[PDB]
Amino acid sequence: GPLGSAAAATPAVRTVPQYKYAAGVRNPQQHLNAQPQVTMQQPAVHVQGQEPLTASMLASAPPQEQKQMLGERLFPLIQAMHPTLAGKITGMLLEIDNSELLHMLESPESLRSKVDEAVAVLQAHQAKEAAQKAVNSATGVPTV
User: Fold this and answer.
1) How far apart are CA 79 and CA 49, in angstroms?
2) Which of 40, 61, 86, 87 has the fewest CB atoms within 10 Å, i.e. the most exposed one?
3) 104 near 115, Cβ under 8 Å?
4) Exposed, middle or buried by CB within 10 Å (0-12, 13-18, 19+), for 44?
5) Pair 111, 119: CB distance under 8 Å
């Protein structure tokens, strides 16, 4: 790496790291009939809306909301990823394990994978046994 941010030691700064570790534990059958272009496994969902919120968006406001839109502007965006399951997801992303707060700002996919994952954590902390008694740690008058 050029600067002292990450650590991977790879001159291949063109492609993204292989985050998909395909283990060869399964039985490698034939099914080698996939030569032409595959149009399946991908619905007809084009991009009609605008650019969503993520790490890229965060880096778009270095001297502005570099540490804000990550969990204070993503709210209207999460509702898209999850059935209006937001309201706390991204807001949590500014207080989660902290590692998700870092990865989300460093990857245009982390903010999404860590958000969706934080959802599993939000639901487990919502109406579950993770009910908090402290009501003074909450917000008072919502700003705009």
Assistant:
1) 14
2) 40
3) yes
4) exposed
5) no
Q: How far apart are CA 3 and CA 13, in angstroms?
A: 13
How far apart are the C-alpha atoms of 32 and 53, rounded to whole Å?
39
Per the CB < 8 A criterion, the answer to whether 130 and 119 are in contact is no
Type of residue found at 25: V
DSSP state letter for 17: P
8 Å CB contact between 58 and 39: no
The technique is NMR
- What are the CA-CA distances from residue 3 to residues 8, 9, 14, 31, 135 (Å)? 12, 11, 16, 45, 43
Distance between CA atoms of 114 and 87, rounded to whole angstroms? 15
Give the dihedral of Cα atoms 131, 135, 140, 142; nearest 10 deg. 0
Q: Which amino acid is at 133?
A: K
Rounded to whole angstroms, the Cα distance separating 20 from 71 reads 27
**Amino acid present at 21:** Y
Q: What is the CATH number of domain 52-125?
A: 1.10.1900.10
